[PDB]
Ligand binder design. Structure first.
Ligand code: NA
Ligand code: ZN
Length: 272
């Protein structure tokens, strides 16, 4: 992963870029009414990567974690802009901010007309295709709260995207004080204290045979939409999808056969 030295520089370069080129974009988000909704901030990667050389290297190396760092810099930039207003009570802070990457440097390794292959797993790139199928939006739980039997420390576990958002019970207390306790209790179903549930949607895109590069039989691909990306396209649209190539899988069981799948975890959708 990245050490604190690299995480600091990444967030600080992004924070200054946003606070200089997207000041009004954050102001409009702050001016919105619904505080629990998810709001995007769209950024041109090409212009961003030109301000700093290391930011583009870490992004292409650790896209998932760099995007997480970007979201932390958006909340700090939002709170700074909010505190600069003469009447900060006229707007409301928004905690669900997502950095959505658009405009990658145009090159064959990042902008694709074909379905990415196994070699491309883990990389952030764009795929252009046509929507052939959309599913209904589903509400899914992505985090579950637990507590320690010895310290009463409430912690959370993350649903594994690669295993279709399934949870695995831990056996180590992640409290600040080293607890040897392996006994924990599940608090997810006992109450609905938070609404930590996300919108989820699957679409199917296919290569466009009307393209010179696409041969006779086009291939298809599942794209996962989450948060504010759901309901952003319909069957028939021409989409350019920016995101991370990933593998979802289910192991063999007693009577069940295994299945592995290459999908695209969308980060931005551009309708053409
Ligand atoms: Na063709
Ligand atoms: Zn504990």
């Amino acid at each position: 992963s990245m050490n604190s030295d690299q995480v600091t520089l990444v967030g600080q370069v992004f924070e200054s870029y946003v606070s200089e080129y997207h000041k009004n974009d954050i102001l409009l988000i702050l001016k919105e009414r619904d505080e629990d909704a998810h709001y995007p901030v769209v950024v041109n990667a090409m212009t961003l990567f030109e301000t700093n050389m290391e930011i583009g290297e870490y992004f292409n190396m650790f896209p998932s974690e760099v995007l997480t760092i970007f979201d932390s810099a958006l909340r700090r930039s939002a709170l700074t802009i909010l505190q600069s207003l003469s009447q900060p009570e006229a707007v409301s802070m928004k905690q669900n901010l997502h950095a959505r990457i658009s405009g990658l440097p145009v090159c064959p390794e990042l902008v694709r007309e074909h379905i990415p292959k196994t070699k491309d797993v883990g990389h952030f790139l764009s795929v252009t295709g046509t929507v052939i199928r959309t599913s209904l939006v589903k509400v899914l739980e992505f985090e579950r709260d637990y507590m320690c039997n010895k310290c009463k420390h409430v912690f959370v576990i993350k649903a594994d995207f690669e295993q279709y958002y399934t949870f695995c019970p831990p056996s180590s207390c992640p409290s600040l004080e080293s607890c040897d306790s392996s006994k924990f209790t599940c608090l997810s179903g006992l109450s609905s204290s938070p609404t930590r549930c996300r919108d989820y949607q699957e679409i199917k895109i296919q290569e466009q045979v009307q393209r010179l590069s696409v041969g006779s039989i086009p291939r298809s691909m599942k794209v996962i939409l989450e948060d504010d990306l759901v309901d952003s396209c319909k069957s028939g649209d021409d989409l350019t999808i920016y995101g991370i190539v990933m593998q979802r899988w289910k192991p063999f069981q007693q009577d069940v056969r295994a299945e592995v799948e290459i999908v695209l975890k969308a980060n931005y959708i551009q309708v053409n």
